[PDB]
């Protein structure tokens, strides 16, 4: 995955549909992991919770549908590759 090349700020705007998707709130509240604003990659504790929450799978699929780029999204000190996150999520659960 891309670990150096940074996303243009416009990449953030791709995430807009998530705010009107109920799965976002359910997943974030259940796990303590935040996508908006982005906290980064889920911690193992957060991932455990996400992997047992149907809505987190729904959320991850909804992010995939936005076609996130393979680049580092920079939000203050938070740095993550959203495409990496969503592609690796399902296998990370087991
Ligand atoms: Cl900094
Ligand atoms: Ni890589």
PDB file of C-alpha atoms and ligand atoms in Angstrom:
ATOM      1  CA  UNK A   1       0.000   0.000   0.000  1.00  0.00           C
ATOM      2  CA  UNK A   2       1.021   3.595  -0.491  1.00  0.00           C
ATOM      3  CA  UNK A   3       2.797   4.865   2.626  1.00  0.00           C
ATOM      4  CA  UNK A   4       4.439   8.089   1.372  1.00  0.00           C
ATOM      5  CA  UNK A   5       2.300   9.747  -1.293  1.00  0.00           C
ATOM      6  CA  UNK A   6      -0.309  11.979   0.347  1.00  0.00           C
ATOM      7  CA  UNK A   7      -3.916  12.351  -0.801  1.00  0.00           C
ATOM      8  CA  UNK A   8      -5.118  15.680  -2.125  1.00  0.00           C
ATOM      9  CA  UNK A   9      -7.475  17.344   0.356  1.00  0.00           C
ATOM     10  CA  UNK A  10     -10.331  16.625  -2.092  1.00  0.00           C
ATOM     11  CA  UNK A  11     -10.087  12.995  -0.978  1.00  0.00           C
ATOM     12  CA  UNK A  12     -11.841  14.057   2.265  1.00  0.00           C
ATOM     13  CA  UNK A  13     -14.856  15.193   0.252  1.00  0.00           C
ATOM     14  CA  UNK A  14     -15.350  11.638  -1.037  1.00  0.00           C
ATOM     15  CA  UNK A  15     -16.306  10.628   2.513  1.00  0.00           C
ATOM     16  CA  UNK A  16     -19.393  12.908   2.598  1.00  0.00           C
ATOM     17  CA  UNK A  17     -21.997  10.151   2.021  1.00  0.00           C
ATOM     18  CA  UNK A  18     -20.897   8.461   5.263  1.00  0.00           C
ATOM     19  CA  UNK A  19     -22.440  11.228   7.397  1.00  0.00           C
ATOM     20  CA  UNK A  20     -25.933  10.282   6.208  1.00  0.00           C
ATOM     21  CA  UNK A  21     -25.274   6.553   6.568  1.00  0.00           C
ATOM     22  CA  UNK A  22     -26.610   5.181   9.886  1.00  0.00           C
ATOM     23  CA  UNK A  23     -23.904   2.465   9.928  1.00  0.00           C
ATOM     24  CA  UNK A  24     -21.278   5.157  10.625  1.00  0.00           C
ATOM     25  CA  UNK A  25     -22.739   6.162  13.998  1.00  0.00           C
ATOM     26  CA  UNK A  26     -23.511   2.569  15.052  1.00  0.00           C
ATOM     27  CA  UNK A  27     -20.005   1.330  14.227  1.00  0.00           C
ATOM     28  CA  UNK A  28     -18.246   4.296  15.873  1.00  0.00           C
ATOM     29  CA  UNK A  29     -20.375   4.135  19.031  1.00  0.00           C
ATOM     30  CA  UNK A  30     -19.993   0.347  19.326  1.00  0.00           C
ATOM     31  CA  UNK A  31     -16.226   0.273  18.836  1.00  0.00           C
ATOM     32  CA  UNK A  32     -14.899   3.663  19.959  1.00  0.00           C
ATOM     33  CA  UNK A  33     -13.085   3.911  16.600  1.00  0.00           C
ATOM     34  CA  UNK A  34     -13.782   7.103  14.665  1.00  0.00           C
ATOM     35  CA  UNK A  35     -13.851   7.533  10.881  1.00  0.00           C
ATOM     36  CA  UNK A  36     -15.285  11.084  10.958  1.00  0.00           C
ATOM     37  CA  UNK A  37     -13.169  12.847  12.093  1.00  0.00           C
ATOM     38  CA  UNK A  38     -10.583  10.143  11.361  1.00  0.00           C
ATOM     39  CA  UNK A  39      -8.748   8.714  14.389  1.00  0.00           C
ATOM     40  CA  UNK A  40      -6.573   6.528  12.145  1.00  0.00           C
ATOM     41  CA  UNK A  41      -6.377   2.743  12.152  1.00  0.00           C
ATOM     42  CA  UNK A  42      -8.469   0.863  14.722  1.00  0.00           C
ATOM     43  CA  UNK A  43      -6.540  -0.343  17.769  1.00  0.00           C
ATOM     44  CA  UNK A  44      -6.718  -4.105  18.427  1.00  0.00           C
ATOM     45  CA  UNK A  45      -9.357  -3.432  21.135  1.00  0.00           C
ATOM     46  CA  UNK A  46     -11.426  -1.347  18.708  1.00  0.00           C
ATOM     47  CA  UNK A  47     -10.989  -3.877  15.915  1.00  0.00           C
ATOM     48  CA  UNK A  48     -12.267  -6.662  18.214  1.00  0.00           C
ATOM     49  CA  UNK A  49     -15.432  -4.644  18.767  1.00  0.00           C
ATOM     50  CA  UNK A  50     -15.775  -3.731  15.071  1.00  0.00           C
ATOM     51  CA  UNK A  51     -15.416  -7.367  13.995  1.00  0.00           C
ATOM     52  CA  UNK A  52     -18.444  -8.289  16.135  1.00  0.00           C
ATOM     53  CA  UNK A  53     -20.617  -5.419  14.866  1.00  0.00           C
ATOM     54  CA  UNK A  54     -22.571  -6.048  11.648  1.00  0.00           C
ATOM     55  CA  UNK A  55     -22.800  -2.301  11.022  1.00  0.00           C
ATOM     56  CA  UNK A  56     -19.004  -1.998  10.913  1.00  0.00           C
ATOM     57  CA  UNK A  57     -18.981  -4.397   7.946  1.00  0.00           C
ATOM     58  CA  UNK A  58     -21.755  -2.304   6.382  1.00  0.00           C
ATOM     59  CA  UNK A  59     -19.722   0.841   7.008  1.00  0.00           C
ATOM     60  CA  UNK A  60     -16.546  -0.651   5.532  1.00  0.00           C
ATOM     61  CA  UNK A  61     -18.440  -1.725   2.402  1.00  0.00           C
ATOM     62  CA  UNK A  62     -19.928   1.796   2.159  1.00  0.00           C
ATOM     63  CA  UNK A  63     -16.391   3.257   2.254  1.00  0.00           C
ATOM     64  CA  UNK A  64     -15.256   0.810  -0.437  1.00  0.00           C
ATOM     65  CA  UNK A  65     -18.125   2.112  -2.615  1.00  0.00           C
ATOM     66  CA  UNK A  66     -16.599   5.624  -2.457  1.00  0.00           C
ATOM     67  CA  UNK A  67     -13.523   4.310  -4.287  1.00  0.00           C
ATOM     68  CA  UNK A  68     -10.901   5.707  -1.878  1.00  0.00           C
ATOM     69  CA  UNK A  69      -7.456   6.286  -3.385  1.00  0.00           C
ATOM     70  CA  UNK A  70      -4.288   4.445  -2.432  1.00  0.00           C
ATOM     71  CA  UNK A  71      -2.643   7.377  -0.639  1.00  0.00           C
ATOM     72  CA  UNK A  72      -2.043   8.748   2.849  1.00  0.00           C
ATOM     73  CA  UNK A  73      -4.863  10.919   4.170  1.00  0.00           C
ATOM     74  CA  UNK A  74      -3.411  13.516   6.551  1.00  0.00           C
ATOM     75  CA  UNK A  75      -5.692  14.931   9.263  1.00  0.00           C
ATOM     76  CA  UNK A  76      -3.485  16.839  11.700  1.00  0.00           C
ATOM     77  CA  UNK A  77      -1.142  14.221  13.175  1.00  0.00           C
ATOM     78  CA  UNK A  78      -3.469  11.435  12.021  1.00  0.00           C
ATOM     79  CA  UNK A  79      -2.216   9.605   8.945  1.00  0.00           C
ATOM     80  CA  UNK A  80      -3.965   6.668   7.340  1.00  0.00           C
ATOM     81  CA  UNK A  81      -4.469   5.010   4.000  1.00  0.00           C
ATOM     82  CA  UNK A  82      -8.254   4.591   3.748  1.00  0.00           C
ATOM     83  CA  UNK A  83      -8.049   2.075   0.881  1.00  0.00           C
ATOM     84  CA  UNK A  84      -5.674  -0.073   2.960  1.00  0.00           C
ATOM     85  CA  UNK A  85      -8.011   0.190   5.948  1.00  0.00           C
ATOM     86  CA  UNK A  86     -11.108  -0.956   4.107  1.00  0.00           C
ATOM     87  CA  UNK A  87      -9.443  -3.635   1.965  1.00  0.00           C
ATOM     88  CA  UNK A  88      -7.687  -5.275   4.916  1.00  0.00           C
ATOM     89  CA  UNK A  89     -10.605  -4.989   7.355  1.00  0.00           C
ATOM     90  CA  UNK A  90     -12.505  -8.242   6.702  1.00  0.00           C
ATOM     91  CA  UNK A  91      -9.441 -10.555   6.757  1.00  0.00           C
ATOM     92  CA  UNK A  92      -8.167  -8.720   9.879  1.00  0.00           C
ATOM     93  CA  UNK A  93     -11.199 -10.049  11.788  1.00  0.00           C
ATOM     94  CA  UNK A  94     -10.194 -13.709  11.747  1.00  0.00           C
TER      95      UNK A  94
HETATM   96 CL1  LIG B   1       2.282  17.331  13.756  1.00  0.00          CL
HETATM   97 NI1  LIG B   2       2.721  -0.708   0.849  1.00  0.00          NI
END
